[PDB]
Amino acid sequence: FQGMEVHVCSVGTSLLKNSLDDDNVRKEIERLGLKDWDRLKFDDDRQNRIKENFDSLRKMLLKFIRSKGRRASAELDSLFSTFEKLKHNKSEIYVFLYSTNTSNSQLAGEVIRDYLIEEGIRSELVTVKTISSEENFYEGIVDLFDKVIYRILKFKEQDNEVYINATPGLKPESIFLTLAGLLAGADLIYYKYQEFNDVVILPSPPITIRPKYLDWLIRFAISGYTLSEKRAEELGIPVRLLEAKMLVERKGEDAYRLKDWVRKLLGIYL
Amino acid sequence: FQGMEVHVCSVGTSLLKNSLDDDNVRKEIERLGLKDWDRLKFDDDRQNRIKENFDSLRKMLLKFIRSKGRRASAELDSLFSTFEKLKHNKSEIYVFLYSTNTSNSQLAGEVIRDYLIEEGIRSELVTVKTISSEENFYEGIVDLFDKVIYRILKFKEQDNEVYINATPGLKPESIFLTLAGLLAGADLIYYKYQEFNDVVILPSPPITIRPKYLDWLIRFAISGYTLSEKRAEELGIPVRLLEAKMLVERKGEDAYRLKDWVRKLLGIYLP
Ligand SMILES: [Mg+2]
Ligand SMILES: [Mg+2]
Numbered sequence: 001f002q003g004m005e006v007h008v009c010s011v012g013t014s015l016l017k018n019s020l021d022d023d024n025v026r027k028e029i030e031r032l033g034l035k036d037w038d039r040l041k042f043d044d045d046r047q048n049r050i051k052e053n054f055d056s057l058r059k060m061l062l063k064f065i066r067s068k069g070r071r072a073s074a075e076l077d078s079l080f081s082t083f084e085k086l087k088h089n090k091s092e093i094y095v096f097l098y099s100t101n102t103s104n105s106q107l108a109g110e111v112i113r114d115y116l117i118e119e120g121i122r123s124e125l126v127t128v129k130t131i132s133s134e135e136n137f138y139e140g141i142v143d144l145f146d147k148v149i150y151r152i153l154k155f156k157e158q159d160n161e162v163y164i165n166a167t168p169g170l171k172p173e174s175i176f177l178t179l180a181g182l183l184a185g186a187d188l189i190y191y192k193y194q195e196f197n198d199v200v201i202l203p204s205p206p207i208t209i210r211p212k213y214l215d216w217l218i219r220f221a222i223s224g225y226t227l228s229e230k231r232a233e234e235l236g237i238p239v240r241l242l243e244a245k246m247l248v249e250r251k252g253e254d255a256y257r258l259k260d261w262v263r264k265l266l267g268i269y270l
Numbered sequence: 271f272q273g274m275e276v277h278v279c280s281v282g283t284s285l286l287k288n289s290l291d292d293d294n295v296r297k298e299i300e301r302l303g304l305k306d307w308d309r310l311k312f313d314d315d316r317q318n319r320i321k322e323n324f325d326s327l328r329k330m331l332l333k334f335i336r337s338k339g340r341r342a343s344a345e346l347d348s349l350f351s352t353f354e355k356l357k358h359n360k361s362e363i364y365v366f367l368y369s370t371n372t373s374n375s376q377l378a379g380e381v382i383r384d385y386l387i388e389e390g391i392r393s394e395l396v397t398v399k400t401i402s403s404e405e406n407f408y409e410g411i412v413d414l415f416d417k418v419i420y421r422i423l424k425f426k427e428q429d430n431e432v433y434i435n436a437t438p439g440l441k442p443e444s445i446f447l448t449l450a451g452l453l454a455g456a457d458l459i460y461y462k463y464q465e466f467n468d469v470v471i472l473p474s475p476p477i478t479i480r481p482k483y484l485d486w487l488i489r490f491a492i493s494g495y496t497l498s499e500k501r502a503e504e505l506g507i508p509v510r511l512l513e514a515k516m517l518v519e520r521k522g523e524d525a526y527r528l529k530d531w532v533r534k535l536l537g538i539y540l541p
Contacts, residue, residue, distance in 0.1 A: 134463075134466075134468045134470050172461040172470065176472060176473060178445050183477070191445075196403055196404070200442065203411060205449070207449075208480045210477060
């Protein structure tokens, strides 16, 4: 599509936590022993309870939102407040949500997506990999490029505006989303402060990779993603500088390998 | 100075919250009705109770850290874990802390600074404006430029490495610190996940303002910070484009004003 106002938003579990204010919901949640379903980790066996009762829980959460309104969740509150601030009309909006492949997050995500659609706002939910260690953190970043950042690219190529809602989600993820999102051409970043109940447009300077580094990185790609130290020397690529910035890693002992996430980043410019 | 490993870190109040585990601290804080001192808002009259008892509370908190270790606060836990990961030695480190000009935050900041110093790590604490509304948000950003980002510029000009600790602090501020910090030449951004007790280096690509925007912004600046529509046209500046990205604002009958924070940003690229 073209000419749309696209909002990109991570999915947290404030909806799950907030819903416990409703006695009906709480009762059912207690019957299932899911009192802290908003905090369940990816490997908690109680995720399977959510999964086995997904349809029932979804419909129940939809009832909760319908009655509660935007304050039902941090996603909804920040989204609707920002539509009003920037004067985005329902018929113009596309809400792009992403959650981890975990039952509790996926439930929040499907409910939020389905409610937006009920309200006349086009919405899509994508699923990304769980980050649970330093090693799989970078695998998660790679997946965010594939599932989210590259979609931002495509939205911009199709002549849409893109607004990043930084309100929900874990800090390190929102920092990445803001950074890579801006490099991919996102227009503005925004954040709703609950403290003073107001939406702020965060400074959104249009940015790009420094030209010298982009040049060096492209040489790396063009030549091969893993390069001997000599080959890299012939190309004028300052490997030790790139290593210090954690863009490449020594693979003993001739070789330097461009990190997977940096390859994805290059995709923005190729 | 030169050749140091400089860590830039915002100051939160996890220290205050964690210290309630110390019976001596907890009973004294209860005496002052400060059980919620970690969440005290900027305009709470009780901030003055912290101020009036600042030196006493500072020593009590120092005793707590001395006994508790790095887990006393998110700052200390993330800093010390990262020194170990990156192999930074105490003699090489400079910890640049910044807190708001509020009693509770400044208390946490001075205690953390003083503790680091006791352990042989050079440290400095600077104070920034409180953000409490959308209007004063941008005044806060401007102050972060003057107090923090411009110091990163100077650390880099004096041949030091700069590492941004994104662990503590409110999300929006950490996002700004990361962006402007990288633009100013910071080397790496890092974050300790408490959940799995490990420090990750966040992706830290070397970045700059897009060239055509930087050109437009510089043309704007050298001509004047508030420009008529007519003059902006003659300079070839697409003011509506800049307005849409919230870099300039329409003022008066026919003028466009470069936002204060954008003027500070340009300071990175001009002298
Ligand atoms: Mg407002
Ligand atoms: Mg590790």
